[PDB]
Amino acid sequence: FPATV
Amino acid sequence: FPATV
Amino acid sequence: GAMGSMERASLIQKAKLAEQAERYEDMAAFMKGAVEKGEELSCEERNLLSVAYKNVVGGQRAAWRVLSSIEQKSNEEGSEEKGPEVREYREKVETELQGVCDTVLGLLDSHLIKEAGDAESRVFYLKMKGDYYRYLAEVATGDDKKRIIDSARSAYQEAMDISKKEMPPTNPIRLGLALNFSVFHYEIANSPEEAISLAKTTFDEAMADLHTLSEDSYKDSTLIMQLLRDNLTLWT
Amino acid sequence: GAMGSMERASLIQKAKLAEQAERYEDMAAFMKGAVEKGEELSCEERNLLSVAYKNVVGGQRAAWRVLSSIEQKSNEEGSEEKGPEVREYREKVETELQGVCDTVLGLLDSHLIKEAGDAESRVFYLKMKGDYYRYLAEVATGDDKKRIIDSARSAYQEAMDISKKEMPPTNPIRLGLALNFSVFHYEIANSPEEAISLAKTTFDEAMADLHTLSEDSYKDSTLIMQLLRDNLTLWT
Ligand SMILES: COC[C@H]1CC[C@@H]2/C1=C\[C@]1(C)C(=C([C@H](C)CNC(C)=O)C[C@@H]1O)[C@@H](O)[C@H](O)[C@@H]2C
Ligand SMILES: COC[C@H]1CC[C@@H]2/C1=C\[C@]1(C)C(=C([C@H](C)CNC(C)=O)C[C@@H]1O)[C@@H](O)[C@H](O)[C@@H]2C
Ligand SMILES: [Mg+2]
Ligand SMILES: [Mg+2]
Ligand SMILES: [Mg+2]
Ligand SMILES: [Mg+2]
Ligand SMILES: [Mg+2]
Ligand SMILES: [Mg+2]
Numbered sequence A, B: 001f002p003a004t005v
Numbered sequence C, D: 001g002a003m004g005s006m007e008r009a010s011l012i013q014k015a016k017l018a019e020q021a022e023r024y025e026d027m028a029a030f031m032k033g034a035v036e037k038g039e040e041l042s043c044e045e046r047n048l049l050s051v052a053y054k055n056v057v058g059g060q061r062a063a064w065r066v067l068s069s070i071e072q073k074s075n076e077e078g079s080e081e082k083g084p085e086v087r088e089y090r091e092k093v094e095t096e097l098q099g100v101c102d103t104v105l106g107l108l109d110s111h112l113i114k115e116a117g118d119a120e121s122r123v124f125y126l127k128m129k130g131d132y133y134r135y136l137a138e139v140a141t142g143d144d145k146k147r148i149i150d151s152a153r154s155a156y157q158e159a160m161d162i163s164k165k166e167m168p169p170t171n172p173i174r175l176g177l178a179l180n181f182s183v184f185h186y187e188i189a190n191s192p193e194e195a196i197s198l199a200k201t202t203f204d205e206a207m208a209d210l211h212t213l214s215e216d217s218y219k220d221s222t223l224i225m226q227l228l229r230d231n232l233t234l235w236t
Helices: C008-020 C024-035 C043-074 C085-115 C119-138 C145-166 C172-188 C192-207 C217-235 D008-020 D024-035 D043-074 D085-115 D119-138 D145-166 D172-188 D192-207 D217-235
Strands: none
Touching (some): C008 C024, C008 C043, C008 D043, C024 C085, C043 C085, C043 D008, C085 C119, C119 C172, C172 C192, D024 D085, D043 D085, D043 D119, D119 D145, D119 D172, D172 D217
């Protein structure tokens, strides 16, 4: 999965 | 802490 | 609710203790109670709220993904029909996840967003609103799937518009908003080109604003910038 | 209870799904429901029950330890009195932990232990009984602290007596029982010499029985043997 914050 | 199972 | 009898300061104190103890459900319940006292949240308190619910729904999402993958394999050609249990338990986790998202969206709508006038709170809350509609979208299938996606897009877009007018390009909230909206485009809206364009523009404009920052402001910022780069590397 | 309408096989199936998803509270609730169907548990089902509750109470214990350490520092000389919140929240976690231990001890008493006649189930359940009284002892202070400690000791001792009569020295349940009883002696009963003696005797007697095992039985066994050695290295 791509990174989120 | 010591190990338990 | 069940936090109605506890002092606001005590709820904040206990939210910080729960965080230290990695008790994120408790954290979230304390922060919900604090929001329900009706006063605006400070900058640090906003971070407690977002961390709490991010970790709760993050665990639910990770579990949902495990179960959905089992469910999909269970529905392949040549798979033994193992009964309704995998679907049922996936649905159980899904309904609980939806419940938490609805709770967060309800706090933002009653009445965090309407009372947030400073850019750093208004963008923060609208980013959360986009995030929790995005999590709803990750599990959505019925008639309102497109409306859930558009609700996420609309919140992110309002946050984006404010952030570009009112914040520097290196502002961590602006950067994190762009990071997540870019992921929304890639993973939810079937718009990889928009996702890539947004991540690259955001990164480049932040690079060019680093020179204005102190050493510490040069930290969460380059931190999020590295996440933008990580995503671009995954995507290209 | 709330699992009363679900098939036993479905509860077992969902316990395995919850484990895969790292949803240990759910796991534990499914396995409690399975136990409450009133049939004995198989070997694999016993492992599901113990894993579920071990992980639930393990997280509660880790949190309790964080909060208790904060509480103790908060009660040092020169510490600002920060109010009742740390004690309150430690008590909240403690009461929840006690609740889970009481639930497990209730399942063992109604009616897992009384119906367990084979050594591998009887020792397994008595070990769990010792373990959950040990966790109660870790947080106990009042008039019944000594009784809680003796309840743990008594369960472990009955398990030890059966295990030595009925199981080989390399049996993983026998080994894990000895590991945990040794920790009970060191950490709970203020008996480090007994803890060390038990761990060393157990290790040596298992070493001398390895030659009888197949390659696979030579696995969880040497696994637990390494934990005995780890503890001895910590202790000497
Ligand atoms: C609603 O969106 C909240 C997002 C926006 C970006 C960032 C956000 C969340 C938190 C509270 C913050 C993070 C920074 C990146 C943490 N740093 C490190 C690890 O070194 C991660 C936390 O989850 C904050 O510290 C950061 O200032 C801001 C608020
Ligand atoms: C009530 O006490 C249960 C204890 C007794 C020793 C051991 C126990 C628990 C479980 C189910 C088992 C473990 C072994 C060591 C796991 N192996 C690995 C990681 O390589 C750890 C699990 O927590 C089992 O597999 C093992 O067979 C037995 C049952
Ligand atoms: Mg008040
Ligand atoms: Mg559903
Ligand atoms: Mg643009
Ligand atoms: Mg039936
Ligand atoms: Mg108490
Ligand atoms: Mg002896």
